[PDB]
Amino acid sequence: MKDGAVMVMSYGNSEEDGSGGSGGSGGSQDLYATLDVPAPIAVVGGKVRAMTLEGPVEVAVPPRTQAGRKLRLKGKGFPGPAGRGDLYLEVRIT
Numbered sequence: 001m002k003d004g005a006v007m008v009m010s011y012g013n014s015e016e017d018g019s020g021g022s023g024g025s026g027g028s029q030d031l032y033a034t035l036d037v038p039a040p041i042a043v044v045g046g047k048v049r050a051m052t053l054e055g056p057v058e059v060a061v062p063p064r065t066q067a068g069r070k071l072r073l074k075g076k077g078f079p080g081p082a083g084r085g086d087l088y089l090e091v092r093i094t
Contacts, residue, residue, distance in 0.1 A: 004054065010071040010089070011062035020072035024085020031077040035089035037061050042069075042093055050089050053078065059089060067093040 012020040024030035035050045045063040049056055059071060069091035077085035 006050070006052065006054075006057035006059055006073060006076060008060040009073050009076075010059055010065065012070075012072045020070055020088075021074065022070075022072065022086065022088065023074075024077055024083065027083060029078050029083040029085025031085065031087040033087065033089055034092050035059055035061075035071065036094050037065060037091045039093050042066065042091065052076075052087060052089075061091065065091050067091060 012018070014020070022030065031053060033050065033052055035048060037048050041048060041061060042065045043063060045061065047058055047060040050059045061071070071089035071091065073087045075084060075086060077087040
């Protein structure tokens with residue numbers, strides 16, 4: 001188990017049609033950053049690297065992801081001294 005690292009959570013594994021469940025908003029517990037994903041890796045799949053709060057991390061994207069796609073990481077935003085929240089990675093097609 002790797003608590004101080006990033007998972008394959010990208011698509012937002014939701015039993016629903018499409019969900020993410022964003023939180024920690026307003027009080028700066030949440031975090032937004034971009035992730036640069038190639039179009040072939042966005043459509044087919046592949047791991048891409050994201051510079052986050054913690055540092056360089058490993059983010060495997062879904063085989064349908066699109067420009068603007070919010071890859072929700074839950075409890076992976078700002079730290080507990082700041083107030084623990086969640087972090088989103090906005091897919092940029094390149």
